[PDB]
Amino acid sequence: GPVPSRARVYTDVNTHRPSEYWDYESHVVEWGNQDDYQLVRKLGRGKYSEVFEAINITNNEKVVVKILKPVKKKKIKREIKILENLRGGPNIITLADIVKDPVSRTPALVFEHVNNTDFKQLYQTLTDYDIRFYMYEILKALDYCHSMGIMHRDVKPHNVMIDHEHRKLRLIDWGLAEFYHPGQEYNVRVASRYFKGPELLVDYQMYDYSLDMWSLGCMLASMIFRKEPFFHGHDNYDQLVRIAKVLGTEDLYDYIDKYNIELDPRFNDILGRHSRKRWERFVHSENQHLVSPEALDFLDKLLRYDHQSRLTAREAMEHPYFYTV
Amino acid sequence: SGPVPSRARVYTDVNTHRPSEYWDYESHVVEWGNQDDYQLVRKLGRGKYSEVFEAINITNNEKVVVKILKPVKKKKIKREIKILENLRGGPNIITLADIVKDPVSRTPALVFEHVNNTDFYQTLTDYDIRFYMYEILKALDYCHSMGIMHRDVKPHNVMIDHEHRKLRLIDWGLAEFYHPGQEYNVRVASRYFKGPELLVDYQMYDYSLDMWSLGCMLASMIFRKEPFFHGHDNYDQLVRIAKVLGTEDLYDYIDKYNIELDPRFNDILGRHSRKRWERFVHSENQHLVSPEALDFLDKLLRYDHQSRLTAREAMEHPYFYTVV
Numbered sequence: 329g330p331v332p333s334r335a336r337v338y339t340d341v342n343t344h345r346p347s348e349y350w351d352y353e354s355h356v357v358e359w360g361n362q363d364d365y366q367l368v369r370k371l372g373r374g375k376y377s378e379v380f381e382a383i384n385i386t387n388n389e390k391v392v393v394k395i396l397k398p399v400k401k402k403k404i405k406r407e408i409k410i411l412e413n414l415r416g417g418p419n420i421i422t423l424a425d426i427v428k429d430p431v432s433r434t435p436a437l438v439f440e441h442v443n444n445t446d447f448k449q450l451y452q453t454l455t456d457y458d459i460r461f462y463m464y465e466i467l468k469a470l471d472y473c474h475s476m477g478i479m480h481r482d483v484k485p486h487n488v489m490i491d492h493e494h495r496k497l498r499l500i501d502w503g504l505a506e507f508y509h510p511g512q513e514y515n516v517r518v519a520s521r522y523f524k525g526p527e528l529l530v531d532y533q534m535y536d537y538s539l540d541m542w543s544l545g546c547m548l549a550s551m552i553f554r555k556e557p558f559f560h561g562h563d564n565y566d567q568l569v570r571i572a573k574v575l576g577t578e579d580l581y582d583y584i585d586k587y588n589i590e591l592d593p594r595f596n597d598i599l600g601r602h603s604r605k606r607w608e609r610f611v612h613s614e615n616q617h618l619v620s621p622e623a624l625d626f627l628d629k630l631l632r633y634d635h636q637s638r639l640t641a642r643e644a645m646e647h648p649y650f651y652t653v
Numbered sequence: 654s655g656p657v658p659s660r661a662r663v664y665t666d667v668n669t670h671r672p673s674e675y676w677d678y679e680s681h682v683v684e685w686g687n688q689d690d691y692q693l694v695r696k697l698g699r700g701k702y703s704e705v706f707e708a709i710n711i712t713n714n715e716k717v718v719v720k721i722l723k724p725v726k727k728k729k730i731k732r733e734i735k736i737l738e739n740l741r742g743g744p745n746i747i748t749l750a751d752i753v754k755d756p757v758s759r760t761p762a763l764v765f766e767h768v769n770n771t772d773f774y775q776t777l778t779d780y781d782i783r784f785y786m787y788e789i790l791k792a793l794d795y796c797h798s799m800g801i802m803h804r805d806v807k808p809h810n811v812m813i814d815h816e817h818r819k820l821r822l823i824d825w826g827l828a829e830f831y832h833p834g835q836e837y838n839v840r841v842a843s844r845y846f847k848g849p850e851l852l853v854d855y856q857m858y859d860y861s862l863d864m865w866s867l868g869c870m871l872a873s874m875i876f877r878k879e880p881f882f883h884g885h886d887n888y889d890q891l892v893r894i895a896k897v898l899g900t901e902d903l904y905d906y907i908d909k910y911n912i913e914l915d916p917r918f919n920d921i922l923g924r925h926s927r928k929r930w931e932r933f934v935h936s937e938n939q940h941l942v943s944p945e946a947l948d949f950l951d952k953l954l955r956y957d958h959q960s961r962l963t964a965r966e967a968m969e970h971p972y973f974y975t976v977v
């Protein structure tokens with residue numbers, strides 16, 4: 329079968345903690361009364377959630393209410409436990425309360441309010457310094473949650489809230505987050521297509537915090553090159569082909585041979601043969617003001633097939649690309 | 654013209670503003686699952702109309718608590734289920750996990766999350782009393798906010814797993830929805846914990862009944878006197894209260910609400926001075942008593958249901974400054 333693998337950092341953080349910390353199935357959730365909140369307006373809508381802006385009528389403070397469709401109760405317990413464990417961590421969305429409406433009994437999570445700025449509106453106004461500044465803020469959140477033995481497993485621009493006026497950033501939507509246990513085989517149906525690491529696309533289940541570093545690399549590549557998304561797959565199989573068109577099919581086979589991975593037969597007719605490209609090839613007149621040798625070197629160290637060779641969040645924070653922050 | 658009406662000072666109109674689906678338990682449709690998923694292990698307790706068992710859910714090998722109900726009144730069973738479904742997941746409220754019937758007996762049964770009850774009182778410190786009293790208040794402020802009065806607050810209805818510092822308020826069979834101006838049956842709660850409103854047959858009571866019962870439990874814990882007000886019948890229970898609170902304030906209460914005192918009180922009530930709470934302090938309990946505890950007790954144990962602290966006001970009392 330496949331060769332086992334483990335994280336290069338924070339490997340045994342959950343092993344050395346009592347079960348209470350990571351055993352979310354045993355976690356007792358206490359659901360308060362949603363009458364303390366008045367819903368103001370709808371902000372967004374997910375596959376299993378609906379996000380509203382609301383007011384806490386006991387202190388007149390704005391909050392964000394995430395109403396969850398109870399499609400899987402174990403998944404709701406997992407998200408709550410992780411949010412409670414990470415509560416107050418740097419740049420982590422702050423869970424303020426857990427409530428249920430008395431008549432509907434629908435689970436709802438109450439968070440600190442964030443005055444988000446638009447992704448398209450920010451895209452063209454962001455300077456090189458801004459990109460470094462906010463990349464460093466996400467790394468603070470990732471190094472923290474990895475140190476707490478949690479993999480976000482859903483990093484993408486939609487899951488990063490920014491209040492640009494206040495230079496405030498929050499990593500949100502922990503619904504896909506999981507506790508890291510060395511040697512554990514995880515479900516690969518995580519994250520979002522454009523941000524899925526090659527480990528997920530080749531069905532290598534023994535992945536770790538390094539999956540987040542791949543997703544972060546995809547975000548960085550989209551920001552510096554103004555190409556959104558950077559790896560534009562049209563299905564999960566095609567996604568690996570788009571990565572292969574940049575990283576090359578030679579290093580893909582070296583990766584699958586190193587871990588004795590069995591490639592799905594659906595790859596047979598679509599994978600082809602591709603050369604490894606130079607990061608400089610993506611530089612153009614519209615994006616050259618965001619690109620630098622430091623940015624390309626940092627990107628090259630995140631976007632690697634081999635999950636074990638990618639920079640850890642702590643190694644990434646020490647990169648020359650961040651010397652100016 | 655009869656007794657003066659009264660309403661709750663807090664959460665007065667919570668049920669009035671909710672659709673009838675929430676509080677109309679008579680219309681609630683109960684779906685009874687198959688009790689074959691549970692195997693009874695042992696008897697934990699026995700009530701007037703129920704037996705509580707420890708059981709094992711054979712589908713996940715997890716312990717549960719099974720309450721088998723004698724179907725003496727189907728409306729009462731629907732009421733309890735609706736309240737438990739409404740409060741499901743609330744802080745320190747026993748969690749209803751399933752509703753089942755044994756295929757052959759067809760006896761109603763409620764399945765709850767397991768609670769590992771400690772035996773216990775002799776070992777509880779001043780801190781422990783403050784901690785557990787605050788946990789009960791979280792449960793009461795929550796259920797009151799959900800428009801429900803427990804109406805049977807007493808030590809037997811409080812399960813504590815001391816090792817894990819976990820507390821659950823159980824036995825919601827006497828619980829009711831609060832509707833302002835509604836006249837309720839006074840034959841509720843357990844004798845030692847009945848509020849004076851019940852004993853003088855003042856039917857328009859509210860959540861404040863639970864705050865009286867909580868005050869009885871507090872007095873019994875800090876003074877190590879169980880029960881605190883030891884009546885031998887419902888009429889004598891008011892006399893035991895009047896021996897502490899005095900008869901002057903009892904007459905002020907009945908006059909404020911134009912209550913007619915039952916003639917059965919004529920020969921037994923007597924005349925009693927208002928006692929100082931310090932009179933109950935002794936060598937055996939002085940380590941549990943403090944000025945803060947006595948001030949807090951004085952604000953719960955009042956004849957006038959409207960003057961008692963609400964659960965939310967109680968949580969802000971100095972007696973709880975030392976708890977998280």
Ligand SMILES: Clc1cc(CNCCc2nc3ccccc3[nH]2)ccc1-c1ccccc1
Nearest residue numbers: 371372444447450459462463485486488489
């Ligand atoms: Cl990662 C990022 C994100 C965004 C804005 N994303 C918000 C999407 C959102 N809004 C929401 C409202 C409601 C619910 C969910 C929401 N998610 C803008 C820029 C960047 C960025 C990061 C680092 C460097 C440079 C740029």
Ligand SMILES: Clc1cc(CNCCc2nc3ccccc3[nH]2)ccc1-c1ccccc1
Nearest residue numbers: 697698705774782785808809811812870874
């Ligand atoms: Cl010291 C104490 C002890 C208990 C324990 N009463 C037994 C619960 C029970 N119910 C049961 C039903 C069925 C079967 C077994 C049962 N056991 C409750 C409350 C307190 C207390 C009171 C005031 C303040 C702080 C603590």
